[PDB]
Design a protein around this ligand. Structure first.
Ligand SMILES: Cc1cc2nc3c(=O)[nH]c(=O)nc-3n(C[C@H](O)[C@H](O)[C@H](O)COP(=O)(O)OP(=O)(O)OC[C@H]3O[C@@H](n4cnc5c(N)ncnc54)[C@H](O)[C@@H]3O)c2cc1C
Ligand SMILES: Cc1cc2nc3c(=O)[nH]c(=O)nc-3n(C[C@H](O)[C@H](O)[C@H](O)COP(=O)(O)OP(=O)(O)OC[C@H]3O[C@@H](n4cnc5c(N)ncnc54)[C@H](O)[C@@H]3O)c2cc1C
Ligand code: SF4
Ligand code: SF4
Ligand code: SF4
Ligand code: SF4
Ligand code: SF4
Ligand code: SF4
Ligand code: SF4
Ligand code: SF4
Ligand code: SF4
Ligand code: SF4
Ligand code: SF4
Ligand code: FES
Lengths: 137, 664, 411, 549
């Protein structure tokens, strides 16, 4: 039974609030994703995601605020640019670009957070362990 | 080696202990790299919990503390205060959310897995806390002055509110008088009170207040700085006439311009009056109207011929200086309020209404001036074509509004329905037997006592044709106006004959308002008005700190809504002045100038314009205005060189969390 | 003679014309600019010990400019980074630099980053059909031409073939035949598509010269007002000869440029598909990058890398001392550079361990360019991350028809 | 006023001899740039080469001569220090013969410095107590490979391994130290060449290998003997090569037989030793890259399989230091004159008498750096040190300190104020590689050129200038050598091996390999092409038994 290793970097104001609301509503989801809780998900550098993938992450999830709903008014657009370029980079280096995703969860969507956890867990179990672990890292 | 961290795990009374093994979590934390003590307690948000935290801090000499409990947004201030009481910096505390994210979502049949997730969360929290520094709270002092740009009702209200709060305030008015648009109105909907009558006490209060410097006939030349200290350079336009204070300062004991008016009586130059929409004559030396706050009689220098007759008209008082130029004043303010107001949309476009080519077609402000008793005539509405009183007046509502054709405006001007009703009432009252026709397309009486006003207007005899005017022709013999539209109710085409046609034109920001709002770093909205900090919960604020918006410059409004907005802006501006300090965000960005390369990419990356490129030790580096930064982290996450330090969320601390996730 | 004209230019002085490669117009222009005191120095290339040794030189004394006449097809080096390092980005010196297409692109990439001052630099760029590494050139000459390299008097690339004039005659071989063997132009030059540097101040070449001026005139394209003023002054002071270009010359010039673009596309396809795809490409890149010994010459030579202290040196990304470096070392460079890489090739040819850095970097470059639509080396538009627009991101998210950045992005 | 000037110079940090461009701006080195014309490295440099310019203009560089008077050092003039050195050296010589003086040089100095050093040590006072740090920094490899092949230098070049088929790295940090000699291994990996590493720990170099073999430390000879025993057992030895070019085969057959299954003497299983041995002896061209019995046994492997006098073959020790080859070639060695001319034989002594205007050359075996240090108080009193820092470098630093204290009148000429300098009585500032104008001799025997980039800081001087001034003050004749080229010509005029390598030929980027007798000779990149350099034209192999640690 191989245990997937998904890392999440979720902003304080919307995604973290959404996860808190999901917990408050007693919405169940598998215990596979652990969070980081940056302030604005525009704090997320590309080197964070790449370091996670190198260190042995099986999947990476970054959750922010809906466009036009950022607490700092522009962070999620910078994050979106960075994550689009990250998807390019993971495809072009031979990694599966579907191992990484960025979601937009607001503070009122706990059920959406549970659905996202289920979907990410299912996708990563389908893809299997990261190839980077086998090749000498 | 030096960091010693204490881990404390809360049971939350079988809320956490019912889903995971707390003993396993504690015994695991006892073996983490930097851990001096690991303890468990039932309710650590209670006073015994704080007592235990303090006792452990004192007896193990902990460098930092990690609490495995509910979400930080619930009890982070609580445990920060707990840690501060005990001899540790508040921001040396770290929290692991093991209830909202581990115990309440993994209840059923997930016991070993939930414990493993708790171990991972505690590991990541300890890894972050081992690299946490001391964040001493710091603040920026605030200059105890305020600036209000715009002397209208919004600017006047904001200035009076700030002054009566005990704050010295500058009121900067472009025109020689403050009153604004309200001074041009004859009556006010829906109460029909005289506008000058309700506004004159406010104007004299502004003029008399010791805490307000009323600088009229001047504008803002440039602005620099931030919320703590705005250095604003103003140009005092050459007024040409001295006030008694300025006359005494100049040297002569003779007073300056008691307002007698002899100069205007002898001036031989005639020019249009902007206050009367250009329908009335005025001299080169003049006042807008009799009820001007500073009764000081400006001279129009680009129209004066320097004949020097007004100086003999003003002898022994020497109030007139024909040969002085604009001065520049550098003022040091704390906050600023923008109240620039509005102007009329140019309805000379939209050719099917003959505003400029037909003589008996006028706009609403011209109508107000023509029907006011202080206007070019004795309040007698007369036709511009021949001066005869009209018996039939049409009102074209929505003139240039809700228009998506690119000529007019796509928004509603908010008050054109109400003052059109007021104008219809005024014509039907002042001229007996006159009939008002209102060509309307969605009558909008939304405010308090507005629907009752609409009912009363209909009851007094006003005709409402529900149809946007298609076009307007004029008869060559009698300059009467044929108005062609459809009565969509009754479903028939209609050609209405009117002696006078009044266009309820849309409103737009005043000329030069966009340059001013760029000068203060305020962004425009997609309608072209000044943008708000938050459209819902901060109607007065702006993204730039220390700048607040009041009045129609934020968007078209009624006088009561404008006054409410102005008072709110005054309160928001007074708050930092009253406190005397602006507390910086606990987690601002710092530039490590030893690593900056002066590329300047990050400058355009901050929504709040905090980042700028400046010299330091002869090198071009980045400078962070801490008063503007908000700890978003966008710049720190971008800079390739790692020259920006997001404290409490630094790159070393976040990577430390990621490293510990993939550890044992 | 004004912003977009095509001209035939040569030198009044017979010596410059004779030593100049295709009419000495570039050298005459540089010499005149240094005479007239428009610039304080000229950064050019001169022969070192032989014709395979190309050395950058800063010339302040004008009568030393004739030594720089003529091109060196073995000079595979990049001027602008040297300017940034050793001339303070020309922030006090007005400079006149002769440059290739890659050199102009590097100029613009460094100007986007405030590293140099383009208002103090005149770019007289030249067309480039490709360069050859000097050791590789000597290996071709000794192996495929059957000639001792020391005896070679001149070597060049014309009409799609490598020609060497050596004592006893001249030989010529199609560049494609050499490239199919493992010789010829540099790997990045085969993929290059910046043939005519229209982003420079003047663009000088020998394509489109026809008839009586086959090798006696230079084709000048005036790409700026600065270059127009320079050429007008050179013509006025009697130091340069200008003639209108014959239109059919421009026709063949455009045809040759299009053929070069097609060849570059062919080589791009060949190399990028030769890397592999899927897990095999990842295995290739990780096995290649495992050889790195952290010389940092890839970082120090790349125009885009401008930082004071590279992230590859910070201890929380790369653990110091451990020589079998993690894959993170090259992923940092991929993240930072692959958006705006000008395919200069310096990273690949300064690498002691023979790691194809330029191949990988350009492979991400082409994908980034086709999705974001940002062409690196022109017009000083900010890098894709230095300037993020609202509508652009909203449209990019809406184009995928999905509420998240997960799938439906690529074809 | 040379706003940006490129100066081509050889890297001073190891024996590969990479070429780089120092950048001079207003008379100060400001950076290092690639030199793509060089065939050695094609403009490529290791971490050290990229940052070889930092120490040139350090503030701690010595600028004036220092003299020790009753304790702390005092600045002095060149005349005062040189006169003191001359007086004390003459007194010591006249009192204690040739035995007393001892001469130590570094293998970092240019060839001219080492040659003029040994010339001064012999043309004046007649002793050959002159040595270098090669004995302790590189090792005894040269002596063993000289016993095997006649000459101890590397037989083939570096890129010649690209023509091989089974590059065999034998316990080397090739990519760690001398990384651009491992660039060739990486290139051969790209070309598709078998590579075998026998590093006793798994390193960067062993990662390029197709096969990796780990063996217990200090058991190289046992594994080599096992390989040779199997190659002899199944007759993969080159009989034709052995008959006409190698002697001593029967004794090898006698010796090697006792190592049929040498497991537990080395940790390599029998199938692995058999596989690697057969792979070596079956490839037509195979090259060994090594890093005295160990190198002698490596020589025995190459002789048995006939991989010496050809392209892409041979044994290539890496040599570890910038001019360890040049220092030994120029005569900075106890019992050789120049180009390994074996002072023992009288004919070379007569030749040096004829060409040096001197009489009664020593003829006796000198003392090495350890020998001089051990007897540094009893009979060796007074000694000249050219670039070494013996206190730090030698094991048991306290013993070196004590014996340096026992001596009288140490001279520790150097560019930096090291821990040895404060035991000295006179300190003469030197010059770094960027301020000299000599030559280096890389490990592959190529003679590369060092060029003057900047001036020395203050009153510092090149070692040739200092030694010439000292000889002028001591009255010795034969040192009127104003420039390094004159010293090079003087060196050429005596040694027959390097007669044809003029500065005109060395100005070419390719340089010149060391066995170059005639002026039109294009050098000798491949050693022992036709015959070996022993007493007869046959290289002799030896039988080594395994002595446990
Ligand atoms: C025809 C008409 C009839 C109306 N009737 C009614 C009614 O009956 N009842 C009602 O409640 N509302 C009525 N309104 C709306 C009312 O006029 C507005 O709500 C109100 O005037 C807005 O207040 P304000 O001070 O923001 O506008 P303004 O009075 O326009 O404020 C702008 C002031 O700032 C000055 N200023 C502008 N730019 C600068 C600058 N760059 N520097 C310095 N000073 C500057 C201007 O000179 C002016 O003094 C009517 C509007 C119109 C057009
Ligand atoms: C490597 C290379 C390849 C070229 N390939 C082509 C080609 O395929 N087709 C074509 O039409 N033109 C090509 N050119 C340009 C061609 O040489 C021009 O026709 C000519 O150089 C300009 O005309 P000219 O004789 O008046 O200039 P010149 O008087 O010859 O002046 C040449 C100038 O270029 C400088 N220079 C020389 N070598 C280099 C170098 N390696 N990098 C940068 N600057 C250098 C010299 O310092 C001098 O300032 C190439 C140039 C180079 C350097
Ligand atoms: S700190 Fe949180 S988890 Fe602990 S008892 Fe209080 S509310 Fe419950
Ligand atoms: S004449 Fe003099 S006092 Fe009278 S209104 Fe004019 S300026 Fe004022
Ligand atoms: S000087 Fe000017 S303001 Fe005075 S009366 Fe003459 S025209 Fe009028
Ligand atoms: S307020 Fe009335 S007249 Fe004015 S735009 Fe709105 S609907 Fe039309
Ligand atoms: S902080 Fe970073 S991005 Fe900003 S100017 Fe400095 S180096 Fe450039
Ligand atoms: S954290 Fe945000 S607000 Fe603060 S300087 Fe950086 S980008 Fe600007
Ligand atoms: S990269 Fe392009 S411009 Fe540069 S040398 Fe190669 S072909 Fe010429
Ligand atoms: S130049 Fe090559 S070996 Fe050096 S750090 Fe870059 S990739 Fe690694
Ligand atoms: S990464 Fe390499 S190929 Fe790309 S621009 Fe930089 S040096 Fe040139
Ligand atoms: S690789 Fe990235 S961090 Fe390093 S110098 Fe280049 S841009 Fe800066
Ligand atoms: S390999 Fe040796 S010679 Fe070459 S740069 Fe490195 S240390 Fe210097
Ligand atoms: S605060 Fe969540 S996206 Fe910025």
């Amino acid at each position: 039974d191989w245990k997937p290793q998904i890392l999440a970097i979720i902003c304080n104001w919307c995604s973290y609030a959404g996860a808190d609301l999901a917990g408050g509503a007693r919405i169940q989801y598998p215990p596979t994703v652990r969070a980081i809780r940056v302030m604005c998900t525009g704090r997320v550098d590309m080197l964070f995601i790449l370091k996670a993938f190198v260190e042995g992450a099986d999947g990476v999830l970054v959750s922010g605020c809906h466009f036009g709903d950022c607490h700092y008014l522009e962070g999620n657009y910078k994050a979106a640019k960075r994550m689009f370029m990250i998807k390019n980079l993971l495809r072009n280096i031979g990694l599966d670009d579907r191992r990484f995703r960025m979601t937009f969860v607001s503070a009122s969507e706990g059920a959406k957070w549970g659905m996202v956890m289920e979907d990410v867990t299912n996708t990563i179990k389908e893809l299997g362990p990261s190839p980077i672990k086998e090749f000498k890292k | 080696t030096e960091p010693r961290i204490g881990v404390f795990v809360c049971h939350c009374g079988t809320n956490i202990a019912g889903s995971m093994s707390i003993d396993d979590v504690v015994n695991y934390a006892k073996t983490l790299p930097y851990v001096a003590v690991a303890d468990q307690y039932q309710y650590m948000c209670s006073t015994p919990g704080q007592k235990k935290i303090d006792d452990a801090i004192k007896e193990y000499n902990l460098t930092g503390v990690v609490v495995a409990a509910c979400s930080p947004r619930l009890h982070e201030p609580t445990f920060r205060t707990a840690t501060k009481e005990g001899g540790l910096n508040p921001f040396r505390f770290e929290m692991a959310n093991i209830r909202e994210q581990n115990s309440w979502v993994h209840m059923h049949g997930m016991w070993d897995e939930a414990t493993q997730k708790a171990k991972d969360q505690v590991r990541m929290a300890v890894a972050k806390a081992a690299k946490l520094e001391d964040l001493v709270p710091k603040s920026v002092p605030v200059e105890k002055t305020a600036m209000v740009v715009g002397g209208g009702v919004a600017g006047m209200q904001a200035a009076l509110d700030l002054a009566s709060a005990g704050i010295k305030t500058y009121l900067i008015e472009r025109t020689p008088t403050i009153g604004g648009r309200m001074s041009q109105l004859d009556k006010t909907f829906p109460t029909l009170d005289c506008s000058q009558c309700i506004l004159t006490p406010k104007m004299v209060d502004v003029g008399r207040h010791p805490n307000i410097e009323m600088m009229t006939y001047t504008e803002v030349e440039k602005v620099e700085g931030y919320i703590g200290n705005f250095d604003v350079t103003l140009r005092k336009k050459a007024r040409g006439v001295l006030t008694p204070t300025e006359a005494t300062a100049k040297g002569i004991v003779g007073g300056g311009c008691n307002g007698c008016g002899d100069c205007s009586a002898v001036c031989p130059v005639i020019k249009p009056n902007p206050f009367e929409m250009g329908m009335a004559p005025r001299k080169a030396i003049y006042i807008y109207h009799a009820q001007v706050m500073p009764l000081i009689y400006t001279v129009d220098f680009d129209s004066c011929v320097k004949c020097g007759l007004c100086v003999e008209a003003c002898g022994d008082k020497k109030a007139i200086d024909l040969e002085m130029q604009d001065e520049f004043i550098t003022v040091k303010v704390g906050t600023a309020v923008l109240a620039t107001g509005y102007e009329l949309f140019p309805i000379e476009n939209k050719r099917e209404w003959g505003y400029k080519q037909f003589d008996n077609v006028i706009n609403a402000l011209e109508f107000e001036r023509l029907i006011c008793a202080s206007g070019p005539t004795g309040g007698h509405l007369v036709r511009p074509s021949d001066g005869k009183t009209p018996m039939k007046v049409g009102f074209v509502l929505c003139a240039g509004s809700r228009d998506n054709t690119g000529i007019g405006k796509p928004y509603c001007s908010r008050f054109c329905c109400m003052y059109s009703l007021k104008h219809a009432h005024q014509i039907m009252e002042k001229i007996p037997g006159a009939v008002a026709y209102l060509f309307y397309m969605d009558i909008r009486s939304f405010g308090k006592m507005y629907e009752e006003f609409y009912y009363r207007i209909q009851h007094e005899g006003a005709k409402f044709i529900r149809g946007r005017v298609a076009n307007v022709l004029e008869d060559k013999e009698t300059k009467n106006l044929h108005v062609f539209t459809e009565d969509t109710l009754l479903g028939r085409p209609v050609d209405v004959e009117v002696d006078l046609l009044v266009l309820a034109a849309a409103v737009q920001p005043n000329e030069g308002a966009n340059e001013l709002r760029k000068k203060f770093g305020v962004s425009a909205s997609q309608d072209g008005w000044m943008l708000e900090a938050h459209p819902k919960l901060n109607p007065c604020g702006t993204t730039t700190a220390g700048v607040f918006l009041a009045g129609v410059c934020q968007g078209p409004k009624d006088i009561p809504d404008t006054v409410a907005q102005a008072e709110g802006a005054a309160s928001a501006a007074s708050i930092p002045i009253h406190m005397g300090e602006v507390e910086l965000e606990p987690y601002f960005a710092m530039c490590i100038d030893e690593l900056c390369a002066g590329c300047g990419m990050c400058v355009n990356l901050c929504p709040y314009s905090a980042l700028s490129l400046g010299e330091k030790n002869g090198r071009t580096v980045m400078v962070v205005t801490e008063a503007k930064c908000k700890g978003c982290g966008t710049c720190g996450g971008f800079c390739p060189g790692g020259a920006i330090k997001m404290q409490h969320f630094t790159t070393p601390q976040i990577v430390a969390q990621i490293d510990a996730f993939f550890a044992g | 003679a004004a912003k977009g004209d095509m001209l035939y230019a040569w030198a009044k002085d017979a010596e410059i014309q004779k030593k100049g490669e295709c009419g000495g117009a570039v050298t005459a222009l540089l010499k005149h600019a240094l005479e007239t005191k428009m610039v304080d120095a000229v950064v050019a290339i001169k022969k070192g010990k032989d014709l395979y040794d190309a050395v950058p030189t800063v010339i302040t004394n004008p009568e030393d400019i004739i030594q720089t006449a003529g091109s060196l097809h073995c000079g595979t080096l990049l001027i602008p980074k040297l300017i940034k390092k050793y001339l303070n980005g020309a922030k006090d010196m007005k400079l006149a630099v002769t440059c290739k297409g890659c050199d102009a692109m590097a100029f613009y990439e460094l100007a986007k980053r405030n590293q140099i001052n383009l208002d103090n630099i005149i770019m007289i760029g030249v067309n480039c059909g490709g360069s050859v590494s000097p050791v590789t050139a000597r290996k071709m000459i000794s192996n495929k031409f059957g000639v001792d390299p020391d005896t070679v008097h001149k070597e060049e690339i014309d009409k799609g073939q490598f020609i060497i004039e050596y004592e006893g005659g001249h030989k010529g071989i199609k560049i494609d035949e050499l490239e199919e063997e493992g010789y010829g132009r540099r790997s990045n030059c085969r993929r290059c598509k910046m043939k005519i540097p229209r982003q420079a101040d003047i663009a000088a070449g020998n394509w489109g010269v026809i008839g009586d001026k086959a090798g006696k005139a230079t084709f000048l394209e005036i790409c700026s007002e600065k270059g127009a003023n320079l050429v007008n002054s050179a013509q006025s002071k009697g130091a340069l000869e200008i003639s209108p270009a014959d239109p059919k010359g421009i026709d063949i010039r455009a045809k040759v440029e299009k053929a070069m673009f097609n060849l570059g596309d062919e080589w791009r396809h060949r190399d990028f598909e030769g890397m592999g795809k899927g897990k095999d490409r990842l295995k290739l890149m990780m096995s290649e990058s495992s050889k790195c010994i952290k010389c940092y010459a890839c970082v120090e030579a790349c125009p885009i890398c401008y930082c004071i202290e590279c992230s590859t040196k910070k201890p929380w990304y790369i653990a110091p001392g451990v020589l079998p470096t993690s894959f993170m070392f090259h992923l940092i460079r991929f993240a930072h550079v692959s958006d705006s890489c000008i395919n200069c090739g310096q990273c690949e040819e300064l690498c002691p361990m023979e790691i194809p850095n330029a191949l990988f970097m350009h492979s991400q470059q082409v994908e980034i360019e086709k999705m974001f639509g940002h062409i690196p080396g022109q017009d000083m538009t900010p890098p894709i991350h230095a300037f993020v627009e609202e509508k652009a991101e909203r449209a990019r998210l809406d184009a995928t028809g999905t509420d998240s950045i997960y799938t439906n992005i690529f074809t | 006023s040379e706003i940006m000037k490129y100066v081509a110079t050889t890297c001073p940090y190891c024996g590969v001899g990479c070429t780089l461009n120092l950048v001079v701006s207003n008379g100060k080195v400001v950076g290092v740039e690639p030199n793509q014309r060089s065939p050695i490295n094609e403009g490529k440099l290791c971490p050290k080469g990229v940052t070889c310019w930092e120490h040139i203009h350090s503030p701690d560089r010595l600028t004036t001569p220092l003299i020790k008077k009753d304790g702390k050092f005092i600045e002095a003039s060149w005349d005062e220090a040189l006169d003191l050195v001359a007086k004390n050296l003459k007194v010591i010589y006249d009192k204690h013969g040739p035995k007393g003086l001892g001469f130590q040089t570094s293998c970092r100095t240019v060839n001219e410095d080492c040659y003029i050093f040994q010339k001064f040590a012999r043309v004046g006072f007649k002793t050959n107590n002159v040595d270098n740090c090669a004995r302790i920094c590189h090792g005894p490899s040269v002596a063993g490979l000289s016993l095997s092949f006649g000459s101890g230098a590397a037989t083939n070049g570096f890129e010649d391994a690209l023509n091989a088929d089974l590059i065999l790295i034998w316990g080397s940090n090739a990519v760690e130290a001398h990384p651009l000699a491992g660039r060739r291994i990486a290139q051969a990996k790209k070309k598709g060449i078998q590579i075998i590493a026998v590093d006793p720990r798994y390193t960067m170099t062993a990662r390029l290998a197709d096969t990796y073999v780990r063996f217990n430390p200090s058991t190289h000879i046992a594994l080599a003997n096992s390989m040779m025993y199997w190659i002899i057992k199944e007759g993969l030895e080159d009989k034709k090569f052995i008959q006409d070019r190698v002697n001593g085969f029967e004794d090898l057959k006698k010796t090697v037989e006792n190592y049929a299954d040498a497991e537990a003497i080395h940790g390599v299983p029998l199938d692995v030793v058999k596989d690697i041995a057969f792979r070596y002896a079956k490839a037509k061209n195979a090259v060994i890259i090594y890093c005295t019995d160990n190198v002698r046994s490596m020589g025995n492997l190459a002789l048995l399989t006939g991989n010496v006098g050809r392209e892409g073959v041979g044994v290539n020790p890496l040599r570890g230091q910038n001019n360890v080859q040049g220092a030994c070639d120029m005569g900075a060695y106890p019992n050789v004159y120049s180009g390994y001319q074996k002072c023992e034989v009288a004919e070379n002594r007569a030749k040096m008498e004829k060409a040096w205007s001197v009489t009664n050359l020593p003829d006796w075996y000198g003392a090495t750096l350890t020998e001089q240090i051990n007897q540094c108080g009893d009979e060796i009193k007074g000694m000249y040190i050219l670039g070494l820092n013996p206190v730090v470098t030698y094991p048991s630093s306290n013993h070196v300190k004590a014996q340096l204290e026992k001596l009288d009148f140490l001279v520790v000429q150097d560019i930096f104020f090291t821990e040895t300098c404060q035991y000295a009585d006179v300190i003469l500032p030197g010059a770094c590689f960027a301020e000299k104008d000599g030559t280096f001799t890389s490990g592959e025997r190529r003679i590369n050129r060092v060029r003057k980039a900047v001036n020395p800081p203050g009153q510092a001087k090149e070692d040739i200038h200092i030694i010439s001034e000292l000889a002028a003050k001591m009255g010795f004749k034969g040192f009127e050598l104003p420039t390094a080229k004159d010293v090079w010509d003087d060196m050429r005029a005596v040694t027959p091996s390097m007669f044809g390598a003029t500065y005109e030929k060395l100005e070419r980027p390719e340089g010149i390999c060391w066995p170059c007798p005639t002026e039109e000779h294009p050098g000798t990149p491949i050693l022992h092409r036709e015959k070996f350099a022993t007493a007869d034209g046959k290289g002799n192999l030896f039988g080594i038994d395994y002595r446990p640690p």
